[PDB]
Design a protein around this ligand. Structure first.
Ligand SMILES: Cc1cc2c(-c3ccco3)cnc(N[C@@H]3CCN(C)C[C@H]3C(=O)NC3CCCCC3)c2[nH]c1=O
Length: 127
């Protein structure tokens, strides 16, 4: 029971939608970040057990990762792009909170966040 349940990636009670913005988030934004050399620690929930970070889920109570975001986008979990943008920002913020300055995971998150902001800068207008 050492790791928490992951964030939900489906919910039969949550209304679902496709928008051009959510298609762009999957096809352009997530695709760009996912194949980056720094993506791999962010491609699934933090395994606090295997990594021996027992305080991770004592400190981080709103976990998020690109594995979860990928499944949410694939499952049409989101109603709008802003929900998905908030998930990316949660993932980056958690990294900046939990880790100390000089930690390479912070420099990796900063590089992914810079690329994230470049890609969402041209988020297309809603059709
Ligand atoms: C999201 C997340 C993941 C993560 C992972 C990981 C690796 C595979 C999956 O997850 C490892 N270590 C972390 N923190 C380290 C804590 C100890 N300091 C000294 C170095 C810290 C550090 O910078 N570690 C990195 C991990 C990636 C390779 C370079 C070293 C992580 N912190 C995070 O917020």
């Amino acid at each position: 029971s050492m790791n928490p349940p992951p964030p939900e990636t489906s919910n039969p009670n949550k209304p679902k939608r496709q928008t051009n913005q959510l298609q762009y988030l999957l096809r352009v934004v997530l695709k760009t970040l996912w194949k980056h050399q720094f993506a791999w620690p962010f491609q699934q929930p933090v395994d606090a057990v295997k990594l021996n970070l027992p305080d991770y889920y004592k400190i981080i109570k709103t976990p998020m990762d690109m594995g979860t975001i990928k499944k949410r986008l694939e499952n049409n979990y989101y109603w709008n792009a802003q929900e998905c943008i908030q998930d990316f920002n949660t993932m980056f913020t958690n990294c900046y909170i939990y880790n100390k300055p000089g930690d390479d995971i912070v420099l990796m998150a900063e590089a992914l966040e810079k690329l994230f902001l470049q890609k969402i800068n041209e988020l297309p207008t809603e059709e």
